[PDB]
Amino acid sequence: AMGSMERASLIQKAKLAEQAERYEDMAAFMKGAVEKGEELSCEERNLLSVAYKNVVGGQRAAWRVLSSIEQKSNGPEVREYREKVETELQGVCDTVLGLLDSHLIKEAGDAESRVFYLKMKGDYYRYLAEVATGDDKKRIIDSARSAYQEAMDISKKEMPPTNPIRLGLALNFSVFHYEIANSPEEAISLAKTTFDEAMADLHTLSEDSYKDSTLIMQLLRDNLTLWT
């Protein structure tokens, strides 16, 4: 419904909405900006990702609360309301996936944009997989895996091992392995190898880049501590 608003005004309002913690508005403004058809800059990609991560993060937290209640109970109300939340979460994931497919990924030629969008694709299929059951769950899991793997292959060829996007991709793919794919050993191996290769490249970084990379490395180590 943002077709009448200037691209630059959508971007400015997405930044205001972030400041106001109005993440649904922020996501709608950034959807409108994507639908203008131009490629997104680095800052604009981050606004798109932060907006949807907050929207779907709230939905995932609510779905987990409701699923836990539903499982304790096993009237229709808890299941019905968990289903409503689940459908709304699926719709947000489908919206993000649709933006990536029309046409952000196909126009992304630089490694930093292409890896960023393919990591997002893996993440939103992963959130779909968290609520999926059975022999839909399998194809959704494979779609997440395939997106993360393409991003990994580009990131290893094109970015240094300390690049924050490369690090966050590896962190999230390791969580995919541990939590979705039932591959805890692959999760641990990926987190360890990523951490060690980043450590060995820290000497090349400025003070500010060092802070950026070590922050994400700490998350890899925190997961390794929890998993071992």
Binding site: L171, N172, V175, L219, N223
Partner: peptide, 9 residues
């Protein structure tokens, strides 16, 4: 465990 929090900036 933790994915990228990714909810700020």
């Amino acid at each position: 465990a933790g994915s990228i929090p990714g909810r700020r900036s």
